[PDB]
Every structure is written in C-alpha cells, then in structure tokens.
C-alpha cells in the first residue's frame, strides 16, 4: 500500500533496525505524498480546500508522532 516514491527512497534508507529510528527519518520519507497538480484556477481552489481539510483533520486526528499509520514504515520496507 505504498507509492513508488517510498520504495525508491526506502531503498536509499540503510542501516536501520528499530522503527523508532525510522520514526526519526519521518519527514524525509514524507515526500511520497507529493500529490502533484496543475496551477489552474480551478485546481488552486481545490488544492487550498484539500490542504485545509487535511490540516483540520490532523488536529482532530491528533495522532502521536510515534503512531504514523498514514505514513508506511519499516514493516513495508
């Protein structure tokens, strides 16, 4: 359940044993959620809406930094 960006970057991640250590290199692997889109007038409003919905959902989600279920970890690796 991962994107090709993760496995490519996961292949570049070496010398890690604990998921906590992988929990340290979190934002480095966060690039797999690029979500590329155009800069059209319609897409820009949609992009703003998506970003607002994601930010507002995370506050209600309130998951701890160790629990990153939305970001694949060392198990998939």
């Amino acid at each position: 359940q991962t994107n090709k960006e993760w496995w490519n970057l996961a292949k570049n991640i070496q010398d890690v044993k604990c998921q906590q250590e992988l929990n340290r290199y979190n934002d480095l692997l966060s690039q797999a959620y690029t979500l590329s889109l155009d800069n059209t007038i319609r897409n820009l409003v949609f992009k703003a809406k998506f970003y607002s919905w994601l930010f507002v959902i995370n506050w209600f989600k309130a998951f701890p930094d160790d629990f990153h279920p939305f970001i694949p970890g060392l198990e998939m690796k």
Binding site: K17, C18, Q19, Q20, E21
Partner: protein, 225 residues
Amino acid sequence: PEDEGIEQQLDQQEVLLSGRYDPKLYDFQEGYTKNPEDDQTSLIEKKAFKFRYRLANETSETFQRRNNRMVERQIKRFQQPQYKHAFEQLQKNIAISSNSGNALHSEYGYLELLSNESVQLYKDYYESDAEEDFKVFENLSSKEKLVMIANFENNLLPKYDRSEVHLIPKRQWEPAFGVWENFLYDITEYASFIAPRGKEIAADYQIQSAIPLTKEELIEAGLYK
C-alpha cells in the same frame, strides 16, 4: 548484622512470598480509561514485569531451583574471557570517565553486555515455560532494549552492604599563621588532599558496586560451588 542489602533482599523475598502479590489474584488493567479495559501494555514490557516479580507468582522451592539454575548459568557466562576483558577495560578507563558525564568507550560496551545478560537471564528464568516465544527476543528496538536492560541484575556482585567509612587525616591550624595565611593553606590542603582522595573514594565505592566479584573469590567464600 543489619546489612542494608541483605536485609532489603530478605524483606523483598518475604513480601513477594506473602501471596499478596501472586499474579492470579489480580487482573492487570489500564485504570486510566473510564470504560474497563485490560492492560494494553507492550508484550516485552509485560514479560519484563513478569520476570522482575518472578517470585511473586512462584513458590519458594520453585524460586530456589530456578534462581539456582539462573545463577549458575550467569556465573558460567560471566566467566567468559570477553566479559573479563570488558571488566578490565571498564576498571582501567575510570579516572577520565570521572571528568565528564559523556559516556566513555568501555561504558557503551558494558551497557550492551548488560542488555545481552538481561536477555539471557529472562530466557533462563522461565526456561521451562512453554508459552513464551524466545524469537521475540531476537531483535529489540531502542525502547525495547532500554526496557530490557532496566531489570538486568549482575548477580555476581557482593551481597554485603557497600556503605563504608574512610578517615582522611586533617591538617591542624598552625598557631603562627595569620587569618589570610591560614585560609590559603587550608584551601590548598582542602583541594589537594580532600578533592583527589574524596573523588577517588567515591569512584572506588561506585566501581565496587559495579565491579562483580571474581568467581574463585566466591568459591573462596563458599558462596558458590
């Protein structure tokens, strides 16, 4: 002799043998939740909690036999040349280690060996148990290893209380010196004698609390056979 360590060990054994700490009499549950929820603690943490209070759910004779086997295995393992070299290096790199809280080279190896010994003791204590997955101890995370090393107990150390007293000669105040001269001489003496000797004594006490006794020494005391 009301030796602190021996008395504390006997009190702990009596408390755990009173039956008021047997695991069957209590149901471990996370009391925080408003709805009754069982203990959702980690598997390694639960195993450590069980091993730490091993005698509480065990009988006296069972504790005696298991502890005897575990202690024999621990003595045999600590008799290894690698452990001897590690202990020698730890004893050597002492004074410099007293100069900062940054860990020395031999101390990290000591911690790793302590974690390995904790794993071995946890495996040996319940060696007859048929509901424990030894492979679960294969690879531990940072938190898992830190938790496991917490209950590690070097059994080869002297069980006697290490609290002692040392007498350091005190230089008297000269009757021919003035206030300033006496203060200067006293400050110089205080530093040069007390600080080195005091630091050495404290480090020696800590090391003795950390350095286990030699196997033959135990044999020389009849502690083990």
